Design a protein around this ligand. Sequence first.
Ligand SMILES: Nc1nc2c(ncn2[C@@H]2O[C@H](COP(=O)(O)OP(=O)(O)NP(=O)(O)O)[C@@H](O)[C@H]2O)c(=O)[nH]1
Ligand SMILES: [Ca+2]
Ligand SMILES: [Mg+2]
Ligand SMILES: [Mg+2]
Length: 166
Amino acid sequence: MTEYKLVVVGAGGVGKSALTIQLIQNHFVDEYDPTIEDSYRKQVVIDGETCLLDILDTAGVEEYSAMRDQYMRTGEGFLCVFAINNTKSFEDIHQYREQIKRVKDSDDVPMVLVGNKCDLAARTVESRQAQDLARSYGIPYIETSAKTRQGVEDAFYTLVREIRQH
Ligand SMILES: Nc1nc2c(ncn2[C@@H]2O[C@H](COP(=O)(O)OP(=O)(O)NP(=O)(O)O)[C@@H](O)[C@H]2O)c(=O)[nH]1
Ligand SMILES: [Ca+2]
Ligand SMILES: [Mg+2]
Ligand SMILES: [Mg+2]
């Protein structure tokens, strides 16, 4: 049926893999195993439409992000993830937005800004600060927790709804 190619990007350790695995496999990965490039596929019904989700989980660690650019080129929408307890990952979003623009050769790419680890209390990125960044990009800001599942489905489904507006 209809297929949506989603790509999850962001700094190392922000929770890209945990988010993807929680969405697809329904469990929380507690350990930290740096990702090279992994893909997941699953048939789901989103807003009444039966579709195929192809999610590319990318590397956030520089040393493991070799051919990242090439893997991303096929993506139709991107989840730009940072962790609410990692100010540097939030400041890093700028770099991922630029990479996406290069990979897609477009300044109009479906995207969603995601502030992950919202279950943690050492918050250094306030909601309003992220809402403002998202507003400047003209995209939605959603907070998530791969641990509790809060906002996880919302984040991924919202990205699909953004692709549909493209
Ligand atoms: N409390 C909490 N921990 C989280 C959350 N998401 C991820 N983590 C934890 O953060 C660590 C890194 O998560 P991981 O998904 O591997 O991050 P990544 O962005 O995929 N890293 P990499 O880019 O190297 O592939 C793990 O110990 C994981 O359990 C969350 O929502 N809440
Ligand atoms: Ca391990
Ligand atoms: Mg990972
Ligand atoms: Mg501050």
